Design a protein around this ligand. Structure first.
Ligand SMILES: [Cl-]
Lengths: 267, 255
């Protein structure tokens, strides 16, 4: 089994080459592709890493694992471009190009995610449809976008711990969960019990990194240290970390990447 | 048997009720859903109409025809929101609503049906090719990187920006029946190509920088439109009365 250094190198190289190959040349789209590529290519590929790690846990990395990892990275990349837009937050894609270009590159990166998952080379349509459903629920009104919406609508108010958790679970939690769920599903071998453990793993890790982030900033608006005290936020990170690892303990050596990734993502 | 007014009323109420029902309630998304619904509802619903009409040409309207018509309308609706942005509620909401309407189009197509998943994947592929880097978005990008171009360049822009979704509508409609044959798709492609071009020529004529009337004269351009409309009809007339909706739609898209 790969240690974290090797596993991150392997999966980053793997998803990067695959994205490059699938983003096929198309002359009318030259300008569009330039902007798309500028955004897809830095970043640490956390979501691809989780996807490949989960596939490895329960079976073997497959063509649909590549499609999932790449689709998830495309969704993530699109969300970052649209998030840097002046109307939201604020060299970014709209700085290097313009705002109009960044908007279209984001839109196209979303469509590319679905292109990745519906490639004709796949002969597993029922599984592809399932992965598409997974991505839809994580990325749209049931997930990521609703989280961004909540974040925007909450910027003047001070929200409760429950509201803060709800916001993060949608805004960043859902795609993290889609990563482990889709990875495992893409093997064609995952059992419902394994998927439930991965759910809980992902939930814990997703929240823990947001809590840890607020703790890091500490060294107006709602944060975990303000809601729980610095001590309470630190304890929560430790508890979530322990919970995440406990969910995958019974898998043995195959769980090492997910264990290593827990520490890395959290910090 | 149905006339256009009737077909329009039938399809618009049908796609609107399907959209409303499929956009299921979800409390955390309340604000987002408000924005989406505000965008999803006026409009002529040309793409749904083409989808249902194309399904009727070759077979029976099915639940996948509904998903298709609704998915196409959500793509079109998101594209209008993003098109209206200053760079081209409030601005941040509009961006998110557009993004969510795109995801909702894929929700619609991937929702459980009785149909084979192979067909659902095909429909998704058609929507992808029409909407993304291979179609609509590249059309919009070309339009941006253009503010003096030739007819050929203008044509290319329109074929992507507008033509691709029109073609997707007729292709997805027929495919969604589960009964389309390849030669029928080739005919629908030719129909879409003809009406799409006729629309652009007519769009140059109305208005009276490369244009069709500059090339051919006003009479020459008018003649070409009548010709393209006839070509579009010629692709579908062999289906008899089943071709009525697409026939009426051709008369109507060309104004
Ligand atoms: Cl299905």
């Amino acid at each position: 089994v790969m240690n974290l250094k090797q596993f991150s190198t392997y999966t980053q190289s793997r998803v990067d080459q695959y994205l490059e190959q699938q983003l096929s040349d198309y002359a009318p789209a030259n300008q569009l592709h330039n902007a798309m590529r500028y955004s897809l290519f830095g970043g640490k590929r956390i979501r691809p890493m989780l996807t490949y790690a989960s596939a490895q846990l329960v079976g073997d990395i497959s063509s649909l694992t590549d499609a999932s990892a790449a689709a998830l990275e495309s969704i993530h990349a699109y969300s970052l471009i649209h998030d840097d837009l002046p109307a939201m937050d604020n060299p970014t894609c709209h700085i290097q190009f313009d705002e109009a270009t960044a908007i279209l590159a984001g839109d196209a990166l979303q469509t590319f995610a679905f292109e990745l998952l519906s490639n004709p080379t796949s002969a597993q349509p029922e599984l592809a449809i399932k992965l598409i459903q997974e991505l839809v629920v994580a990325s749209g009104r049931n997930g990521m976008i609703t989280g961004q919406m909540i974040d925007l609508s909450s910027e003047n108010k001070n929200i409760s711990l429950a509201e803060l958790e709800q916001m993060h679970v949608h805004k960043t939690g859902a795609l993290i969960k889609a990563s482990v769920r889709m990875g495992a599903l893409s093997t064609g071998q995952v059992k419902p019990e394994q998927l439930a453990k991965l759910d809980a793993y992902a939930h814990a890790i997703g929240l823990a990194f947001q809590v840890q982030d607020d703790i890091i900033d500490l060294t107006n608006k709602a944060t975990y240290p303000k809601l729980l005290g610095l001590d309470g936020a630190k304890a929560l990170v430790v508890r979530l970390h322990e919970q995440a690892i406990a969910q995958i303990s019974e898998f043995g050596d195959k769980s090492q990447p997910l264990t290593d990734l827990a520490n890395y993502i959290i910090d």
